[PDB]
Amino acid sequence: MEPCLTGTKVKVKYGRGKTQKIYEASIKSTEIDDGEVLYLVHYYGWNVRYDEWVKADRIIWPLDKG
Amino acid sequence: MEPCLTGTKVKVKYGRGKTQKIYEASIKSTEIDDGEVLYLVHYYGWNVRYDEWVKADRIIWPLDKG
Known part of the structure; x- marks a missing residue:
């Protein structure tokens, strides 16, 4: 888990420029690397x-967690 | 939890201007509100x-998770 972001239903930017699309995904896991957060998305x-x-x-x- | 940020040992900005300090804290929980992430810190x-x-x-x- 309840205090975690895992399971949050999000949208993810994919690709670049004219062909960039937004896909719906879940947060599966989190990483911390060099002062930044990374997310494994499904x-x-x-x-x-x-x-x-x-x-x-x-x-x-x-808008909300959920 | 292992895939969660909970338990991560971080530093947190506290106060403003000339008297702002940095305190060591843990991430206890996470919230999502209006497209942003918030963290409950201890x-x-x-x-x-x-x-x-x-x-x-x-x-x-x-630098790393941990």
Whole structure:
């Protein structure tokens, strides 16, 4: 877990420029590296092979936890 | 929890201007509110009455998780 961000339903920026898209994902895990937070995200309805570690600036958080 | 930020040992900005100080704290819990993350922090060696919810910009993360 309850105090954790794991399980939070978020949106994630994917790709760059003209072809950037937003995908819905869950937060699976968190990492701290060199003073920054990273999140392992699972894209709903996508194969687990696409789960990825993303920098904090790629996450679009919802209005509430939940 | 292992995938959570809870328990991470961090530093927290406290106060403003000339008298701002940095205190060591742990992450006790997380909140999501209006597209932003907030953290409940416990200041080590301080009474639990001083535990507080802080905005993400007040947290100084360490080099690794841990």
